């Protein structure tokens, strides 16, 4: 579906952003 | 410090994007 | 419903981001 | 200016999330 | 129309994340 | 260092989010 493809892409963006956020936390703490 | 705050904000933003994706899926399912 | 529940969560994230924004302004100012 | 720039960006994201929440309620209400 | 408002809000979030990326680069290269 | 990598990744996330928003706008338009 059209909106399902948009949502899938958004979910991948969000998972990538969560990883970046964790990496930045660890750099910050260190 | 500031970078740890920024990391938390990126995590909040990722959470919002994931929820927006689920909202789009529910809209499609309607 | 499902979309209204997401809307509430997004409003809470928005408040969290505004709190972090003020924390960053405080760090910059001080 | 870096931290203040990020704070301003987070505030704009917060506004955008409130806009999305409002749109979701409008969709939900039909 | 509400879905278009959601898309416009996502565009604003993307611009704001670009500004956050730019600010973090400035901190990194400082 | 790491923060430069994080900023570049965030810029890539923002570019992708812009494309997602544009696709959603076109869906919303018909």
Author numbering:
A (entry chain D), B (entry chain F), C (entry chain C), D (entry chain B), E (entry chain E), F (entry chain A): 1 to 30
Task: Provide excerpts from the study.
Here we describe efficient routes starting from validated parallel and antiparallel peptide assemblies to design two families of α-helical barrel proteins with central channels that bind small molecules. Computational designs are seeded by the sequences and structures of defined de novo oligomeric barrel-forming peptides, and adjacent helices are connected by loop building. For targets with antiparallel helices, short loops are sufficient. However, targets with parallel helices require longer connectors; namely, an outer layer of helix–turn–helix–turn–helix motifs that are packed onto the barrels.
Our designs focused on the g-a-d-e sites of the classical coiled-coil heptad sequence repeat gabcdef, as these sites contribute most to the helix–helix interfaces. Specifically, we investigated 20 sequence combinations in which g = Ala, Gly, Leu, Met or Ser, and a and d = Ile or Leu. We solved high-resolution X-ray crystal structures of three peptides using ab initio phasing. One structure, with g-a-d-e = Ala-Leu-Ile-Ala, revealed an antiparallel hexamer consistent with its solution-phase oligomer state. However, this was a collapsed bundle, conflicting with the solution-phase binding data that suggest that this peptide can access an open α-helical barrel. Also, we have reported a parallel α-helical barrel that accesses both an open barrel and a collapsed bundle in the crystal state but still binds DPH with low micromolar affinities. Thus, it is possible that Ala-Leu-Ile-Ala and Gly-Leu-Ile-Ala can also access an open conformation in solution.
